[PDB]
Subunit: 143 residues, 12 copies
């Protein structure tokens, strides 16, 4: 179900909002400003994704999740308890989670096509476009 994948993704969005703030505060190295500013852009993107997924859920006549509790329960994103990083470790982690979201947005898109929910398709394909652009850029950082 479309709204089930939406909920799952909403859960990842708020979890990544937090995870990315970790990287924002705890990066080390002459790389600090760039990663500090870039992580800020990343978590702000995730705050919007969170809101947008929730609002698609509501639009669709269902209930978005409303507690951090359900988010942790529905997410497939590993929270990061460590508190120190080189930029390369941050990019590897973010890349991993991006590849996860990419897979899921594809699923979201495929599922919504099947159920004749075209709006959810164009939302999912728009997010895929962004994820694939970032995936490429992150791959290029790490190469």
């Amino acid at each position: 179900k479309t709204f089930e994948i939406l909920k799952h993704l909403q859960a990842d969005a708020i979890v990544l909002f937090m995870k990315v703030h970790n990287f924002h505060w705890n990066v080390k190295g002459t790389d600090f400003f760039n990663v500090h500013k870039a992580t800020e852009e990343i978590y702000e993107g995730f705050a919007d994704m969170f809101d947008d997924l929730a609002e698609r859920i509501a639009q669709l006549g269902h209930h978005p999740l409303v507690t951090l509790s359900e988010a942790l329960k529905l997410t497939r994103v590993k929270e990061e308890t460590k508190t120190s990083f080189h930029s390369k470790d941050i990019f590897k982690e973010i890349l991993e989670d991006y590849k996860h979201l990419e897979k899921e947005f594809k699923e979201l898109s495929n599922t919504a096509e099947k159920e004749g929910d075209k709006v959810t398709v164009t939302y999912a394909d728009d997010q895929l476009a962004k994820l694939q652009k970032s995936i490429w850029m992150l791959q290029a950082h790490l190469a």
Copy 2:
């Protein structure tokens, strides 16, 4: 300890970030736009508070919390599982949590004065100023 109160408040900030999004999505009544836009301003404020508290913690040589897990563990904010509200219920809840943050920022301020951490004082008094302005406005909504 100053950094202990900071951590506690950081936990409330991310919890209220979520709680306020609930109110953002699930308000009902001819009041919808105003509460939808106002809650958006409120949660954006909480996103900044979260970041700022975390960054004061780091500055002070300690570790801010880095998971939703610790946040739920350290918060004194009740998450809201209900998914429908009149504006009056939203304002009552927000008011309650504001009164909670007000008390704690006072504590933060008092404690930091004692430990000779003046920066943390001016941060705490700046946040008090905002909380007391909102507390007054919310009291005026409900009267």
Copy 3:
């Protein structure tokens, strides 16, 4: 035919442009500013929809409609002759007409997919996205 639905929708757009101005001028109640400003945003949206539908028609090698006469002839939107409203009546009427446009944009989208007119699809799905967001918000006003 794609261009036939386009024409129909173009007719509704100019009719709603007028209808919404009625609500803009004739709302009553302590609700006045909010509804006055919101209706202004709504009719400005409809002015753009009108222009865009007409311009898709032209692009497609056909003729958009060019008189209020044809608009009244092609529309399924009831004009509103009454000249006084509470905000709730305005929202109910706007909701009704929105549900009408939603149905038709779905048709437009489905029909254009069939005829291999992909541009018209992405236009129709973009408008659906907006209509479904407003439909949800209006449902929330009225609940």
Copy 4:
């Protein structure tokens, strides 16, 4: 009566809003961009005139017209059913309708002076100023 002329003019404004969109979509010749952009400015002006006339009517304790139906009934503007133009034909038509509005705004102004409605006078003289500037520019196009 002042409000009677206001209503008449309100009817012309919405009719010209449509008529001018015709010219916007259906101009032909190496003149296309200039006329396309200029007609867009013209119809946006007419959308404001429409709103302003309606709002003067309301202010004056009367009811502006609220349907395209009454507009077609009250207008002295010929709708244009043709769907192809050279720029010269567009300017001739617009000039004609401008000369019509000029005459009527003079009447509006004279009538409002008589009835001691000074606000309506300053509104009418402001619109005359604009019409006479455009009339001159259009005469210069055609010369």
Copy 5:
């Protein structure tokens, strides 16, 4: 005399500047933000009216009033000592005072026409335009 009415109006402007701040601080109800922001726009308008009337007086070779003392002495506006309101009470009061200013600006306009002071006429008619727009909007709030 033109300058006598100017002085009277200048006195009302500063008195309403204060009166409107009362409403700004002391409104109660789920209406709070809207009335708080709208009253702020209203008193800022009155601050400009005050300055403009004073400056017309100076231009005309006379002396505007320069103390709150003369203002209270020359005003026909009742100061409001009460410190709590519903929005409806605020709108009724503002409406009353608006109707008062409307009457006086008409007088100002008529008197200035007689004395051949055309500048003061166009100033008075510009203010009438604004007062009549607000009077209509306030009537619509209360209906």
Copy 6:
């Protein structure tokens, strides 16, 4: 005749454009910046007045003047051949020429009322408003 006064004023506008540039370049004293910047605002105003008067003339079916030659022939403004000033001398000269334009705009306004040219009236009264504001400010400089 309205257009005759317009032409006369157009001639003064271009003459004052030049005269004011003299003051702009040739002021002396610790007053230099203020007078340099203020004269720049003054001549830019005169450049617009020039254009606007010319364009009213054209609108009215007549020909504005098109050479400096006719301007010098039609102006009642004394050109200034001297090349050094204290600010007080500049203000006295500008004041004189302002009083001249004020008189003429009154004439323009009166004459246009008589001939039923309302647009030219509202133009003349708008310029009077500006001239009387500047006249007051200049009187205040010199007092």
Copy 7:
């Protein structure tokens, strides 16, 4: 009591709002623009101070003053009935009243520290900062 000093200062703010407008309209000399613009900045500052003091009072659970009447009753600011000034006289008067506000903001700050009202302290110290900057600048004008 903190709120008692707040009220007193609120009274001075509205009185200085008026007093400063006097100086704004009635300054004489080649100094006119600078003093006209500077007084405009000064009274706009006082309008904000007025609003802010009133709003601190409300926040604190008390009632700000709501009439010009109480303002004149609570102020220690002498109103200025004279209607003509050299810039030096304006600066001397403003300086005097500034020194008065400086003393009182110190009192406000000291008193609020005692009562544990930290928000009011940071407000009072912020205003002191501004007053001491202006006091220095005004002393420099007069030296």
Copy 8:
């Protein structure tokens, strides 16, 4: 293959970037400014298309082309060696090349649907939308 069509289009984009600059520099006639500015907008669009196609190629794990050499080798766009034009000749040429890109973007879109590359579809349909709008406008210039 999707990436093969992308590469082809990337080649056309840089070739049209140049071709359009030819028209930019070498248009003749009283049409000069309009065509000079419009061609500037057109080539800036092509510079972005070039970059975007290249970046989609990279995202997709392939290599965009990196020399003018490959571009000339992969393009189906005829370079223009002539150095003088009337606007009509420029529009005919641009129209031709647009019709070419339209065909190819359709192919791109169809092919990407087949291979399950949804991002490339939404990119191709977005570009089609723009090409069909320009095709219509250019047809209207030439009619």
Copy 9:
């Protein structure tokens, strides 16, 4: 002498300021807007050139000209008494006068190099750059 050429050019600048306004008001044809706006840019350029030449003269210890009288006396620009034009006639005239200014700025530049006035050289070469760009564009209009 450098300052002699400066004065000559200053005279042409104010004469062209007027001449170009003629073209601004009196162009005829479907070309009207473009020429109306372009002439406005041209005369605004000439107003700046005028001011800049005058200010270079002053800088150099000499006196710029301060009357329209000297301008007409020092200019080699023919004033235009005719009051109706096709765009082609306007461009031919402007081109002629441009070729004149180009020649003179070359002279200015050469002369200033000789006298070791480098500032005047860089001013003259900057103006040449602009004149040669416009000369090319005007040649392209007329071809």
Copy 10:
């Protein structure tokens, strides 16, 4: 000949436009964003240089080059076929090509001085200024 060097440089500009896009897409390493953004600024500079050189050529009565074909024929810039880089390799390549352009702009400048083409001199010296600033910055990257 001046125009011969201009043409040569125009050829390098479009070749570097492409070459720099290579570096834009194909940089690898934790350096990615900085080099991605900086290369974007560099190629945008080259797009302007290209246009400006072409337009100087036209101004000078000659024909700029109008095909990628002539560009490859006239350039002394080696195209880069490789598709992967560390930032250091990108900077070395860009530095090399910069040193090439620097030499040529000197030649351009010297040659134009000889032929009395001062405009082309000030253009060449302006570009030298930029090239020498970038050369220094690039040397500093590599040191």
Copy 11:
């Protein structure tokens, strides 16, 4: 004494203004842009600190220092004569000097509390806030 510490800090501010420009010009490595831009932000901050400290001194009735001579005499900042750096060396040096300013601003703050100079306290605590944020960021660069 408060003003003695102010003077000392003023001396460091201008010395660091220079020192930081050294780092701005003489950094080496693929780090160049980031350090070049960041040092520019740092020295601009120091220019403001310098001005603000000087202006607090003046406000307090004392004399800020007015020569580079006294600055070198009063500073505890070592000037840097070396002319080449890796970014790590720049950050270590800046960190050292920051730790120095932090200590001194604490002293300033403590001393001003003692002397009842609250304005100087809030200034000192504001600067501490900034220094501690930068100290943390610099520590993070170097870790």
Copy 12:
């Protein structure tokens, strides 16, 4: 040598940066704001001149000066130890130092022409242009 004069001028720039701040803080008289703001513009100009001269030095393969120490050693600018001024004294001092910089920029320009350093010439002539404009304005203040 070009770089020797550059260094000398760099030394004056930082010395004048300080000297001008003296005038900024210590001007007395009803002239205070104007001189306070103007000196702020002047020292900000000198901060840029300083940076630009240093960066030309680096570009040229030499080392700009990096301590206040060398600046005081290389400058021909007298530092000002006095701490109180009338505006006339400030303008006389600034004028003197300007005349000094003018002479030196001429030398810089002449020397750079000789050594074939054209970039340094265009930099020197640009600064001369500014110095001669300010010299004229300052002469006009003092006359």
